[PDB]
Amino acid sequence: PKGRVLLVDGHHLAYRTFHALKGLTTSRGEPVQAVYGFAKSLLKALKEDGDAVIVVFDARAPTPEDFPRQLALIKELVDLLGLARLEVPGYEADDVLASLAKKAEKEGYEVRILTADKDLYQLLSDRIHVLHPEGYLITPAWLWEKYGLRPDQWADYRALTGDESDNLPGVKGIGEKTARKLLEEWGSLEALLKNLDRLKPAIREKILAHMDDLKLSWDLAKVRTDLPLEVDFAKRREPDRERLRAFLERLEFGSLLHEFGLLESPKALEEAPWPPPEGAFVGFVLSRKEPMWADLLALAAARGGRVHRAPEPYKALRDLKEARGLLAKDLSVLALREGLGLPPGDDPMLLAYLLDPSNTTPEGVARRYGGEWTEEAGERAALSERLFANLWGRLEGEERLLWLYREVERPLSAVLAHMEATGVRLDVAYLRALSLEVAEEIARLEAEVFRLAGHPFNLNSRDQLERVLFDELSTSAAVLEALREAHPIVEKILQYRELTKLKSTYIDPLPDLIHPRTGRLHTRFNQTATATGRLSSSDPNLQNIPVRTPLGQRIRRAFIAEEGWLLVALDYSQIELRVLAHLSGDENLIRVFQEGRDIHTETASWMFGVPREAVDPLMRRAAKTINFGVLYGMSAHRLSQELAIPYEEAQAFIERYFQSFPKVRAWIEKTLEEGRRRGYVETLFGRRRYVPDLEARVKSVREAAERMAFNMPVQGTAADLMKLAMVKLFPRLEEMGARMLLQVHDELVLEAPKERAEAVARLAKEVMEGVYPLAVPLEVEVGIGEDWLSAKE
DNA sequence: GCGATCCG
DNA sequence: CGGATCGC
Ligand SMILES: CCCCCCCCO[C@@H]1[C@@H](O)[C@H](O)[C@@H](CO)O[C@H]1O
Ligand SMILES: [Zn+2]
């Protein structure tokens, strides 16, 4: 076999499907059952595959009205997939097919004709087989075993039969054999098709009592294999994915495009029955990225390289001890919502993350490390183990990373799954009432601005606003940052914008975010993804709910405990600064946290040489500002700017600050010193982050990297500390019948039963407070309440 | 000092 | 498509 040729009877499959699924249409009218039916059966054949694919069409009058519309889509689709389209003018589609089949077969190919019209069974041979839509491969064996015939005498058999419209009314019977129970029996000596006179009624009677009719039934052999055509059986070309998506989407069937990819999948590797060997990397494909709201379609597992596919995804999950592989945590969250407790084990995504945090998505790391993130469960599971091997062999030598992996990240994956799976209850009545309120407010703003501008210009349309501003007695980047002057209108628009963004980001999405099966929101939490090592949240991003602002507080208020439960919000007090005191070891900073005093007030004294009890507001504010600034950069230029009044005496403030805290500065120094030498910095626990730009050419960016270099150790250590705390806390939490729900900034929020709350709150405080030993003490401020704002921090 | 998820 | 706010 030089190759496999799949001849598709586009002509008839199109007609068939038009009368199949008859009601199907895109909710807008536009019927689509023919297009659908045709695509669906086409995929099946292509799943089975072939090298060349030729969909033959006819080259109208008393045919269906809407049929041509869908037929054009049929051809368009055929083309979009890279398959060949063939319609010879003045030739019936079946004659062309019979010939393509024969020519290819002669040319040493193996041919499979995707069709349903029984006529083609006459071509049927070794090498030439038929593929019926419904199913079954039709072969010569099939024919002899099911009909008792051979292709060479099937065109004949059917001649004296009829099927549909192959008109032949009147068969009689004879021994109740009719014509069907008969059929084969007249093969022994023709009569109708050459010699034989006297014979039994019907069989011969009806034969002669029906001239003309045979001179029509001849259509059965109307499968001439000798039509001279040129088309070559070349392999199907590259499918126009960009348009194919658009196509399927125009028809509303974009959602099934997933299967269309499943044909360009590289040659399959060895397989085995479902149950996989202990420790096989799993793979999976979901209907949507968000696991809680996802349909698990396809579960697979590779071990050794043999890939195993689960016949039944949703049940196979019970055959696994753990979900081990790319996106484990996500599979577990789903298994959890399926009443199955499937533990997330190893995951290449975690090892990759550790090696270098510029590894966040499974599409990225896979591409980076010699692979690709496909959509097939098998392919994915294979990639998964392959990656694991590779990334482990590296990380393994790394004793700091390896500790981080086994003790923090990997155990953290299981903790996250549960939070995602459990979720939080929202006060949707409060939420809806809130939306109603914020709405009126945005209005007030819109009005105010139109009042100033005069002309009721449609705000929220960059280009019209640009105009309006530039006559009010760009924006992106430039004036967006610079959207102010001695003008109230700019502020009014700025308040309108935030009230809207908060609205269209938290206030509105929230209700839909409530899962029907559980009655609560499931904020997705991600381990990798950030640059410092912090946990990012999505749907919603809790991280971006404004803190301390009335609107922010009003928003949090929506998250509530479960009826007879209370929420316990535990916040780490200045964890970043105590981490600084520790990392730098600046005995003064250390001293303050040790004495248990208001670091700001203290920093003020040592800066303005006055007793703690003498430090005035402006004093402590400068101190607080400097303190916060230390953490990310603040230059000096910013410092003054922020402190507003400081006329470059800001440099004075900084010097005084480092004078009191000399080691803090020595830390900045060393940090950058080693960083720009080693190529990276690290957190207290060895979490590595590369900052190549510390040696950047454009000082503008060399500045930025500087920031990151010391910023990562501090924020980074804080990130690790929390992750580890959650890892220790989780177990004891389940013991107490309590539950972890969120994690935002340096906070953790638990839901616990009524008065269990007090015990739970204390246990949590202790665990967190004593997570990991540090120079300065770790302080956890806890709050217990009914709504998130009740607990507060 | 830039990010993270959503806007529009 | 690409950019911004709250975030730390
Ligand atoms: C413990 C109390 C110590 C004294 C608190 C006030 C210190 C101010 O001391 C001065 C600053 O005024 C000046 O800006 C810089 C320039 O280097 O010199 C500092 O050392
Ligand atoms: Zn046909």
DSSP character string of A87-107: --TTS-HHHHHHHHHHHHHHT
The DSSP output letter for A278 is: T
Name the CATH superfamily housing domain A1-150: 5'-nuclease (3.40.50.1010)
Name the CATH superfamily housing domain A422-522: Taq DNA Polymerase; Chain T, domain 4 (1.20.1060.10)
Both tokens of A561, joined, read 């405990």
Instruction: Determine how many CB atoms are found less than 10 A away from the CB of residue A758.
Output: 14
Environment class of residue A611 by beta-carbon count within 10 Å: exposed (0-12), middle (13-18) or buried (19+)?
exposed
For A106-128, letters b (16+ CB in 10 Å) and e give eeebbbbbbbbbbbbbbbbbeeb
CB A723 within 8 A of CB A530: no
Q: What residues does each domain of chain A span?
A: 1-150, 151-223, 275-421, 422-522, 523-574+719-790, 575-718
A115 C-alpha to ligand 2 centroid (Å)? 6
Both tokens of A584, joined, read 């730098």
Identify the helix (H) or strand (E) that includes residue A497. Answer: helix A488-502
A151-223 and A523-574+719-790 in the same fold:
no
Q: Cα A581 vs. chain centroid, distance in angstroms?
A: 41
CA distance A19 to A13: 10
Q: Is A296 helix (H, G, I), strand (E, B) or coil?
A: strand
Q: How was this structure determined?
A: X-ray
CA distance A111 to A125: 10
Q: Which residue is nearest to nucleotide C3 (CA to C1')?
A: A476
Identify the helix (H) or strand (E) that includes residue A594. Answer: helix A587-595
CA distance A461 to A111: 59
Both tokens of A340, joined, read 């199955």
Cβ of residue A540 lies below 7 Å from strand B = yes
Instruction: Determine how many CB atoms are found less than 10 A away from the CB of residue A148.
Output: 12
Nucleotides of chain B touched by protein CB (<7 A): 1-8
CB A77 within 8 A of CB A35: yes
A626 C-alpha to ligand 1 centroid (Å)? 15
HSE-CB at A113 with a 13 A cutoff on CA atoms is 34
The DSSP output letter for A173 is: -
Cβ of residue A463 lies below 7 Å from strand C = no
Question: If you compute the radius of gyration of chain A from its CA atoms, what whole number of angstroms results?
Answer: 37
Environment class of residue A373 by beta-carbon count within 10 Å: exposed (0-12), middle (13-18) or buried (19+)?
middle
Identify the helix (H) or strand (E) that includes residue A537. Answer: strand A536-538
Please report, as a single letter, which amino acid is at residue A226: D
The spacing between the Cα labelled CA in A478 and the C1' in C2, in angstroms, equals 14
Q: Which residue has a Cα nearest atom 13 of ligand 1?
A: A652
A120 C-alpha to ligand 2 centroid (Å)? 7
CA distance A464 to A473: 16
Place of tokens 């590369």: A690
CB A53 within 8 A of CB A236: yes
Place of tokens 């839909």: A512
Where chain A is discontinuous (C–N > 2.5 Å), the residues before each break are: 59, 275, 473
- Of A729, A689, A708, A762, whose CA–CA distance to A533 is shortest? A689
- CA A792 to each of CA A261, A552, A557, A567, A763: distance values in angstroms, whole numbers, following the listed order: 49, 11, 9, 10, 18
Environment class of residue A463 by beta-carbon count within 10 Å: exposed (0-12), middle (13-18) or buried (19+)?
exposed
Place of tokens 């992750």: A723
Name the closest nucleotide to A477, judged by C1' and CA: C3
Ligand nearest to the CA of A659: 1
Q: Is A565 helix (H, G, I), strand (E, B) or coil?
A: strand
CB A743 within 8 A of CB A726: yes
Instruction: Determine how many CB atoms are found less than 10 A away from the CB of residue A474.
Output: 11
Q: Could you tell me which CATH number the domain at A575-718 has?
A: 1.10.150.20
Both tokens of A736, joined, read 């107490």
In degrees rounded to 5, what are phi and psi of residue A182? -80, -80
Q: Could you tell me which CATH number the domain at A523-574+719-790 has?
A: 3.30.70.370
CA distance A324 to A331: 9
CA distance A357 to A346: 17
Q: What is the third-level CATH fold of A275-421? A: Nucleotidyltransferase; domain 5 (3.30.420)
The spacing between the Cα labelled CA in A263 and the C1' in B3, in angstroms, equals 40
CB A51 within 8 A of CB A154: no
Task: Collect all residues with Cβ–Cβ distance below 8 Å to A338 and sequence separation of at least 6.
Answer: A296, A314, A317
Environment class of residue A214 by beta-carbon count within 10 Å: exposed (0-12), middle (13-18) or buried (19+)?
middle
**Angle, in degrees to the nearest 10, between helices A410-422 and A699-735:** 70
Give the atom of ligand 1 at the shortest distance from the alpha carbon of A652. 14
CB A166 within 8 A of CB A219: yes
Identify the helix (H) or strand (E) that includes residue A72. Answer: helix A67-80
The count of residues in chain A is: 793
HSE-CB at A524 with a 13 A cutoff on CA atoms is 20
Q: Which residues are near ligand 1 (CB < 6 Å)?
A: A 606-607, 609, 652, 655-656, 659
Task: Collect all residues with Cβ–Cβ distance below 8 Å to A698 and sequence separation of at least 6.
Answer: none
Q: Which residue has a Cα nearest atom 10 of ligand 1?
A: A656
Both tokens of A423, joined, read 């979720």
A656 C-alpha to ligand 1 centroid (Å)? 5
Per-state percent for chain A, helix, strand, coil, to nearest 5: 50, 15, 35
CA distance A687 to A412: 15
In CATH, which of 3.30.420.10, 1.10.150.20, 1.10.3720.10, 3.40.50.2000 is domain A151-223?
A: 1.10.150.20
CB A155 within 8 A of CB A53: no
Both tokens of A162, joined, read 């009829």
Both tokens of A507, joined, read 């206030």
Cis ω for the linkage preceding A777 (within 30 of 0): no
The DSSP output letter for A542 is: G
CA distance A125 to A638: 84
CB A359 within 8 A of CB A365: yes
Place of tokens 């999405």: A509
Q: Is A782 helix (H, G, I), strand (E, B) or coil?
A: strand
Q: Cα A449 vs. chain centroid, distance in angstroms?
A: 41
Kindly write down the DSSP assignment for every residue of A217-255, as one continuous string. Answer: HGGGG---S--------PPP----HHHHHHHHHHTT-GG
In angstroms, this model's resolution equals: 3.0
